Design an enzyme around this catalytic site. Structure first.
Site, PDB file in Angstrom:
ATOM      1  N   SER A 103      -0.252   4.349   2.703  1.00 21.86           N
ATOM      2  CA  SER A 103       0.268   4.270   4.599  1.00 21.86           C
ATOM      3  C   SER A 103       1.648   3.976   4.476  1.00 21.86           C
ATOM      4  CB  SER A 103      -0.190   3.493   5.272  1.00 21.86           C
ATOM      5  OG  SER A 103      -0.178   1.711   4.655  1.00 21.86           O
ATOM      6  N   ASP A 120       0.754  -1.147  -0.023  1.00 14.94           N
ATOM      7  CA  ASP A 120      -0.137  -0.147  -0.168  1.00 14.94           C
ATOM      8  C   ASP A 120       0.452   0.986   0.271  1.00 14.94           C
ATOM      9  OD1 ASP A 120      -2.188   1.547   1.107  1.00 14.94           O
ATOM     10  OD2 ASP A 120      -2.109   1.124   2.753  1.00 14.94           O
ATOM     11  N   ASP A 156      -2.268   6.195  -4.737  1.00 14.02           N
ATOM     12  CA  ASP A 156      -2.394   5.147  -3.455  1.00 14.02           C
ATOM     13  C   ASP A 156      -2.765   3.617  -4.364  1.00 14.02           C
ATOM     14  OD1 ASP A 156      -2.998   3.569  -1.360  1.00 14.02           O
ATOM     15  OD2 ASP A 156      -5.004   5.154  -0.303  1.00 14.02           O
TER      16      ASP A 156
HETATM   17  C1  0ZL Z   1     -14.623  -1.851  -5.055  1.00 14.70           C
HETATM   18  C2  0ZL Z   1     -14.542  -1.941  -3.668  1.00 14.70           C
HETATM   19  O1  0ZL Z   1     -12.632  -1.691  -3.222  1.00 14.70           O
HETATM   20  C3  0ZL Z   1     -12.011  -1.389  -1.955  1.00 14.70           C
HETATM   21  O2  0ZL Z   1     -13.187  -0.630  -1.184  1.00 14.70           O
HETATM   22  N1  0ZL Z   1     -10.480  -1.870  -1.904  1.00 14.70           N
HETATM   23  C4  0ZL Z   1     -10.371  -1.165  -0.871  1.00 14.70           C
HETATM   24  C5  0ZL Z   1      -9.191  -1.661  -0.118  1.00 14.70           C
HETATM   25  C6  0ZL Z   1      -8.689  -3.501  -0.342  1.00 14.70           C
HETATM   26  C7  0ZL Z   1      -7.279  -3.523  -0.522  1.00 14.70           C
HETATM   27  C8  0ZL Z   1      -9.735  -3.836   0.467  1.00 14.70           C
HETATM   28  C9  0ZL Z   1      -9.939   0.319  -0.546  1.00 14.70           C
HETATM   29  O3  0ZL Z   1      -9.773   0.441  -1.787  1.00 14.70           O
HETATM   30  N2  0ZL Z   1     -10.234   0.531   0.828  1.00 14.70           N
HETATM   31  C10 0ZL Z   1      -9.295   2.016   0.689  1.00 14.70           C
HETATM   32  C11 0ZL Z   1     -10.640   2.705   1.207  1.00 14.70           C
HETATM   33  C12 0ZL Z   1     -10.672   3.990   1.603  1.00 14.70           C
HETATM   34  C13 0ZL Z   1     -10.240   4.651  -0.291  1.00 14.70           C
HETATM   35  C14 0ZL Z   1     -12.178   5.061   1.911  1.00 14.70           C
HETATM   36  C15 0ZL Z   1      -8.384   2.283   1.426  1.00 14.70           C
HETATM   37  O4  0ZL Z   1      -8.426   1.939   3.060  1.00 14.70           O
HETATM   38  N3  0ZL Z   1      -7.451   1.473   1.234  1.00 14.70           N
HETATM   39  C16 0ZL Z   1      -5.878   1.667   2.609  1.00 14.70           C
HETATM   40  C17 0ZL Z   1      -5.619   0.570   1.994  1.00 14.70           C
HETATM   41  C18 0ZL Z   1      -6.436  -0.638   2.704  1.00 14.70           C
HETATM   42  C19 0ZL Z   1      -6.512  -1.039   4.177  1.00 14.70           C
HETATM   43  C20 0ZL Z   1      -7.347  -2.030   4.625  1.00 14.70           C
HETATM   44  C21 0ZL Z   1      -6.583  -3.314   3.990  1.00 14.70           C
HETATM   45  C22 0ZL Z   1      -5.793  -2.716   2.348  1.00 14.70           C
HETATM   46  C23 0ZL Z   1      -6.012  -1.677   2.921  1.00 14.70           C
HETATM   47  C24 0ZL Z   1      -5.148   2.453   2.687  1.00 14.70           C
HETATM   48  O5  0ZL Z   1      -4.919   3.119   0.571  1.00 14.70           O
HETATM   49  C25 0ZL Z   1      -5.586   3.861   2.818  1.00 14.70           C
HETATM   50  O6  0ZL Z   1      -5.802   3.862   4.774  1.00 14.70           O
HETATM   51  C26 0ZL Z   1      -4.932   5.269   3.167  1.00 14.70           C
HETATM   52  C27 0ZL Z   1      -5.931   6.552   2.941  1.00 14.70           C
HETATM   53  C28 0ZL Z   1      -5.510   7.832   2.519  1.00 14.70           C
HETATM   54  C29 0ZL Z   1      -7.723   6.458   2.409  1.00 14.70           C
END
Ligand code: 0ZL
Ligand code: 0ZL
Lengths: 326, 326
Positions: B35, B32, B215
């Site tokens: 983070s 990722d 990201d």
């Molecule tokens: C079609 C729906 O898809 C998803 O919701 N996918 C998830 C990731 C999937 C690998 C489960 C997603 O985009 N999650 C984002 C949600 C956010 C855009 C509302 C997220 O939390 N991604 C994490 C990483 C994820 C978190 C869950 C575990 C997998 C890694 C990180 O990028 C963020 O914390 C960054 C921040 C600036 C938003």
């Protein structure tokens, strides 16, 4: 010789990656010696287990060939109905061309919906291949893609990295001393004759021999319910909820080896091989499962056993080669 | 130069495998760039998601050094609290010796339960790393395990094989033309200034810039609720249930490029790239999330974007390099 790396998930399911098509769509599959068919979810499958799983789209492969041959397969856990098509399969860094494989149409049940893999790659004999579809290894040998007519499995312990299927070769770094060869009694599964099962010298099961298959696709060591029910008592495991024949983890250091004598040689599983322990809890490595066949009710020697014995499966001479892992 | 292949699971998740420990235990982690922390489940974790996922056991590692530090990380979807520890992470070929990472203790929520991966390896800047835990790329560079202070991601489209994270090198063969280098605006995430989102000459969103991050751990293209709302309308997607802002697949040939101008260059997105189609079902690639930061509401250029543009995240000079996939 192909090297197919395998992911060890909870010491229960070892799976690797393959690509099917041009360009290649990727799928993770179980490498099963209890079956002979390769198949993955397809865009035609309506079953719930297909929605959350990588699906094969034939209209995206420039090399795909369709056939009308339908296919149906039932495993101890799960079934699928499908249709057979043709394509390149990249498995273990080899380009298996013109491989017939199953595209699923239904995968009935909740089991597989939960599973972290897409399909199954069978590695048993063509005689058990549903709809007569050429097994992968068979098609590789037939094409001159593997150097030898044998593959071998090393399954890691303790969720470690490094489980491998070596297609066309053995690697002596995985075992101690030398391979013992056992003839396949009946050729369909890798069926070998079990001479007896003892603990403290007394036969506790399989008196006067029984039939056993070496199955990479079974997690536990499975056997005819009544027999296994004894062994469970002989180690003090008892039922919790749904198959959890729970045992105290303190017990591990008191129990004796259970010895499997195959072709005159003794293959002991220590208590620390046949008791699976997650974190702070232990369970029994033995599962009861009556599997009636024309050659007798089987004893399946699953990952619980294969974890301790590097296994070679020689098709050139229909022999299983076993030696203790390094 | 580490080569880490990722499994493209349904174009929504791209995960790879690492080993932590001597001897090394397998885990699949999401790489990722949103983070900076590496964590895996461990045998301390009691939570539901921790039971069906591999757990790091410090007791089976001869190279583990424990710490007293606590870790807590809230993500967009999900969170963890854990304890920190040191060990050898084998990532992409490299044996990242003496690397700090989180052993989780809770993983609250059923979605992580159901997810096909164990952990997250964060790839952003140290400023945002929880507990000031050294991010893996940083620890590789400080020890000189990578040549160049940059990494590159290629994310395949269509569940194809071949998605890869290349640690310490760029690979020319995955893109068309030559890299356009965007400066990072604020350094935490791989944050850049998005000048405008137009569609057929007109600014549909973010006039006069807005802040975006590239990201890899975000599946869809995300942006502030109210802005994305207008884009969903302008393309036709409508909700069904728990999103499923679904679109008639027929519309893929009417719709136009939405265009993201980043540092004066236009980066278009075809319908084919912004409407997701599993099987015979097309849903919309935009998702509405308000992500407040001290530098404004963030736009997240996730997987939807990165599948069309090969991305180099270069730490040597604080800059992102984009060029179209070849
Ligand atoms: C079609 C729906 O898809 C998803 O919701 N996918 C998830 C990731 C999937 C690998 C489960 C997603 O985009 N999650 C984002 C949600 C956010 C855009 C509302 C997220 O939390 N991604 C994490 C990483 C994820 C978190 C869950 C575990 C997998 C890694 C990180 O990028 C963020 O914390 C960054 C921040 C600036 C938003
Ligand atoms: C703790 C209990 O563990 C399991 O249920 N494990 C599953 C497999 C796991 C890898 C997902 C299993 O052992 N299933 C056996 C059931 C057996 C105890 C009756 C099975 O059907 N294995 C399949 C292979 C499995 C099928 C499910 C998907 C993974 C491959 C195949 O080997 C046999 O059907 C062969 C026949 C001679 C008995």
């Amino acid at each position: 010789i192909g090297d197919e790396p395998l992911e060890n998930y909870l010491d229960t399911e070892y799976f690797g990656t393959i690509g099917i098509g041009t360009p290649a769509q990727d799928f993770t599959v179980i490498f099963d010696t209890g079956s002979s068919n390769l198949w993955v979810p397809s865009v035609y499958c309506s079953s719930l287990a297909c929605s959350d799983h990588n699906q094969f789209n034939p209209d995206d492969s420039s090399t795909f060939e369709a056939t009308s041959q339908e296919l149906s397969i039932t495993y101890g856990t799960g079934s699928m109905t499908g249709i057979l098509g043709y394509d390149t399969v990249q498995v273990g860094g080899i380009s298996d061309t013109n491989q017939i494989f199953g595209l699923s149409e239904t995968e009935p049940g909740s089991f597989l919906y939960y599973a972290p893999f897409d399909g199954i790659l069978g590695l048993a004999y063509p005689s058990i291949s549903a709809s007569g579809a050429t097994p992968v290894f068979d098609n590789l040998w037939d094409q001159g893609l593997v150097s030898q007519d044998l593959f071998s499995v090393y399954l890691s312990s303790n969720d470690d990295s490094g489980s491998v299927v070596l297609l066309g070769g053995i690697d002596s770094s995985y075992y101690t001393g030398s391979l013992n060869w056992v003839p396949v009694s009946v050729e369909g599964y890798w069926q070998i004759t079990l001479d007896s099962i003892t603990m403290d010298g007394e036969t506790i099961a399989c008196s006067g021999g029984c039939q056993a298959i070496v199955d990479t696709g079974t997690s536990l060591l499975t056997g005819p319910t009544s027999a296994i029910a004894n062994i469970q008592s002989d180690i003090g495991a008892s039922e919790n909820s749904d198959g959890e024949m729970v045992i105290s983890c303190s017990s591990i250091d008191s129990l004796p080896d259970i010895v499997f004598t195959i072709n005159g040689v003794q293959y002991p599983l220590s208590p620390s091989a046949y008791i699976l322990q997650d974190d702070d809890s232990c369970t029994s490595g033995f599962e009861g499962m009556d599997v009636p066949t024309s050659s007798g009710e089987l004893w399946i020697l699953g990952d619980v056993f294969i974890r301790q014995y590097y296994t070679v499966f020689d098709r050139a001479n229909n022999k299983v080669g076993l030696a203790p892992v390094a």
